[PDB]
PDB file of all heavy atoms in Angstrom:
ATOM      1  N   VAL O 192      43.694  35.949  -1.750  1.00 88.64           N
ATOM      2  CA  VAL O 192      44.681  36.912  -2.198  1.00 88.64           C
ATOM      3  C   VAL O 192      44.924  36.687  -3.684  1.00 88.64           C
ATOM      4  O   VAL O 192      45.083  35.547  -4.112  1.00 88.64           O
ATOM      5  CB  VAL O 192      46.000  36.801  -1.412  1.00 88.64           C
ATOM      6  CG1 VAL O 192      46.892  38.000  -1.686  1.00 88.64           C
ATOM      7  CG2 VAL O 192      45.771  36.617   0.082  1.00 88.64           C
ATOM      8  N   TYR O 193      44.958  37.778  -4.455  1.00 90.72           N
ATOM      9  CA  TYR O 193      45.431  37.720  -5.827  1.00 90.72           C
ATOM     10  C   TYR O 193      46.312  38.936  -6.095  1.00 90.72           C
ATOM     11  O   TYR O 193      46.361  39.868  -5.292  1.00 90.72           O
ATOM     12  CB  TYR O 193      44.258  37.571  -6.803  1.00 90.72           C
ATOM     13  CG  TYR O 193      43.412  38.799  -7.039  1.00 90.72           C
ATOM     14  CD1 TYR O 193      43.787  39.757  -7.969  1.00 90.72           C
ATOM     15  CD2 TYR O 193      42.220  38.990  -6.357  1.00 90.72           C
ATOM     16  CE1 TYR O 193      43.008  40.879  -8.207  1.00 90.72           C
ATOM     17  CE2 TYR O 193      41.430  40.108  -6.583  1.00 90.72           C
ATOM     18  CZ  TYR O 193      41.825  41.056  -7.512  1.00 90.72           C
ATOM     19  OH  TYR O 193      41.056  42.169  -7.747  1.00 90.72           O
ATOM     20  N   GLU O 194      47.035  38.874  -7.217  1.00 91.51           N
ATOM     21  CA  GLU O 194      48.001  39.892  -7.587  1.00 91.51           C
ATOM     22  C   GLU O 194      47.291  41.015  -8.339  1.00 91.51           C
ATOM     23  O   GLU O 194      46.772  40.793  -9.430  1.00 91.51           O
ATOM     24  CB  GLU O 194      49.104  39.269  -8.444  1.00 91.51           C
ATOM     25  CG  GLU O 194      50.169  40.264  -8.857  1.00 91.51           C
ATOM     26  CD  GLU O 194      50.824  40.949  -7.672  1.00 91.51           C
ATOM     27  OE1 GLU O 194      51.563  40.268  -6.943  1.00 91.51           O
ATOM     28  OE2 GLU O 194      50.557  42.145  -7.458  1.00 91.51           O
ATOM     29  N   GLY O 195      47.298  42.217  -7.750  1.00 90.83           N
ATOM     30  CA  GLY O 195      46.628  43.377  -8.317  1.00 90.83           C
ATOM     31  C   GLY O 195      47.471  44.117  -9.358  1.00 90.83           C
ATOM     32  O   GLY O 195      46.927  44.881 -10.153  1.00 90.83           O
ATOM     33  N   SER O 196      48.794  43.911  -9.343  1.00 91.68           N
ATOM     34  CA  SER O 196      49.664  44.505 -10.349  1.00 91.68           C
ATOM     35  C   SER O 196      49.841  43.529 -11.516  1.00 91.68           C
ATOM     36  O   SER O 196      48.908  43.450 -12.335  1.00 91.68           O
ATOM     37  CB  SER O 196      50.997  44.895  -9.773  1.00 91.68           C
ATOM     38  OG  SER O 196      51.854  43.769  -9.684  1.00 91.68           O
ATOM     39  N   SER O 197      53.007  37.199 -14.497  1.00 91.22           N
ATOM     40  CA  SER O 197      52.426  37.097 -13.137  1.00 91.22           C
ATOM     41  C   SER O 197      50.897  37.146 -13.170  1.00 91.22           C
ATOM     42  O   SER O 197      50.277  37.995 -12.505  1.00 91.22           O
ATOM     43  N   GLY O 198      50.312  36.207 -13.941  1.00 87.35           N
ATOM     44  CA  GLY O 198      48.876  36.179 -14.195  1.00 87.35           C
ATOM     45  C   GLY O 198      48.101  35.499 -13.064  1.00 87.35           C
ATOM     46  O   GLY O 198      48.064  36.012 -11.939  1.00 87.35           O
ATOM     47  N   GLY O 199      47.516  34.326 -13.368  1.00 90.91           N
ATOM     48  CA  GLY O 199      46.452  33.737 -12.560  1.00 90.91           C
ATOM     49  C   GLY O 199      46.888  33.249 -11.174  1.00 90.91           C
ATOM     50  O   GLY O 199      46.477  32.169 -10.749  1.00 90.91           O
ATOM     51  N   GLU O 200      47.646  34.083 -10.445  1.00 89.50           N
ATOM     52  CA  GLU O 200      48.269  33.705  -9.184  1.00 89.50           C
ATOM     53  C   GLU O 200      47.334  34.047  -8.024  1.00 89.50           C
ATOM     54  O   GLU O 200      46.956  35.203  -7.858  1.00 89.50           O
ATOM     55  CB  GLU O 200      49.588  34.458  -8.981  1.00 89.50           C
ATOM     56  CG  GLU O 200      50.515  34.443 -10.185  1.00 89.50           C
ATOM     57  CD  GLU O 200      51.643  35.460 -10.117  1.00 89.50           C
ATOM     58  OE1 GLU O 200      51.347  36.652  -9.893  1.00 89.50           O
ATOM     59  OE2 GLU O 200      52.813  35.060 -10.303  1.00 89.50           O
ATOM     60  N   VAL O 201      46.994  33.044  -7.205  1.00 89.06           N
ATOM     61  CA  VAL O 201      45.975  33.209  -6.183  1.00 89.06           C
ATOM     62  C   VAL O 201      46.336  32.382  -4.950  1.00 89.06           C
ATOM     63  O   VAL O 201      46.871  31.282  -5.063  1.00 89.06           O
ATOM     64  CB  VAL O 201      44.589  32.825  -6.738  1.00 89.06           C
ATOM     65  CG1 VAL O 201      43.572  32.556  -5.642  1.00 89.06           C
ATOM     66  CG2 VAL O 201      44.063  33.870  -7.715  1.00 89.06           C
ATOM     67  N   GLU O 202      46.032  32.934  -3.769  1.00 90.19           N
ATOM     68  CA  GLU O 202      46.033  32.168  -2.535  1.00 90.19           C
ATOM     69  C   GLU O 202      44.612  32.116  -1.986  1.00 90.19           C
ATOM     70  O   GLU O 202      43.901  33.118  -2.004  1.00 90.19           O
ATOM     71  CB  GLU O 202      46.968  32.791  -1.496  1.00 90.19           C
ATOM     72  CG  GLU O 202      48.422  32.385  -1.655  1.00 90.19           C
ATOM     73  CD  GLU O 202      48.755  30.971  -1.212  1.00 90.19           C
ATOM     74  OE1 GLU O 202      47.826  30.221  -0.842  1.00 90.19           O
ATOM     75  OE2 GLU O 202      49.950  30.628  -1.217  1.00 90.19           O
ATOM     76  N   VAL O 203      44.241  30.952  -1.495  1.00 87.35           N
ATOM     77  CA  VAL O 203      42.996  30.818  -0.730  1.00 87.35           C
ATOM     78  C   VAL O 203      43.397  29.962   0.500  1.00 87.35           C
ATOM     79  O   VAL O 203      43.700  28.804   0.380  1.00 87.35           O
ATOM     80  CB  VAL O 203      41.835  30.164  -1.457  1.00 87.35           C
ATOM     81  CG1 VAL O 203      40.631  30.080  -0.534  1.00 87.35           C
ATOM     82  CG2 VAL O 203      41.498  30.944  -2.714  1.00 87.35           C
ATOM     83  N   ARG O 204      43.430  30.581   1.670  1.00 86.76           N
ATOM     84  CA  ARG O 204      43.774  29.844   2.878  1.00 86.76           C
ATOM     85  C   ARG O 204      42.760  29.966   4.039  1.00 86.76           C
ATOM     86  O   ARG O 204      42.162  30.986   4.189  1.00 86.76           O
ATOM     87  CB  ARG O 204      45.131  30.289   3.407  1.00 86.76           C
ATOM     88  CG  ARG O 204      46.234  30.237   2.385  1.00 86.76           C
ATOM     89  CD  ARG O 204      46.950  28.903   2.365  1.00 86.76           C
ATOM     90  NE  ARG O 204      48.185  29.132   1.653  1.00 86.76           N
ATOM     91  CZ  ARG O 204      49.363  29.299   2.230  1.00 86.76           C
ATOM     92  NH1 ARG O 204      49.484  29.186   3.541  1.00 86.76           N
ATOM     93  NH2 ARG O 204      50.418  29.554   1.484  1.00 86.76           N
ATOM     94  N   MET O 205      42.635  28.888   4.788  1.00 85.55           N
ATOM     95  CA  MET O 205      41.772  28.876   5.940  1.00 85.55           C
ATOM     96  C   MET O 205      42.481  29.579   7.086  1.00 85.55           C
ATOM     97  O   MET O 205      43.630  29.314   7.325  1.00 85.55           O
ATOM     98  CB  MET O 205      41.475  27.452   6.323  1.00 85.55           C
ATOM     99  CG  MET O 205      40.661  26.688   5.307  1.00 85.55           C
ATOM    100  SD  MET O 205      40.683  24.920   5.607  1.00 85.55           S
ATOM    101  CE  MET O 205      39.842  24.810   7.184  1.00 85.55           C
TER     102      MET O 205
END
Side-chain angles (χ1 to χ4, degrees), residues 192-196 198-205:
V192 192
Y193 74 84
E194 181 57 70
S196 81
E200 312 165 307
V201 162
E202 276 285 5
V203 179
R204 307 270 196 101
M205 294 166 65

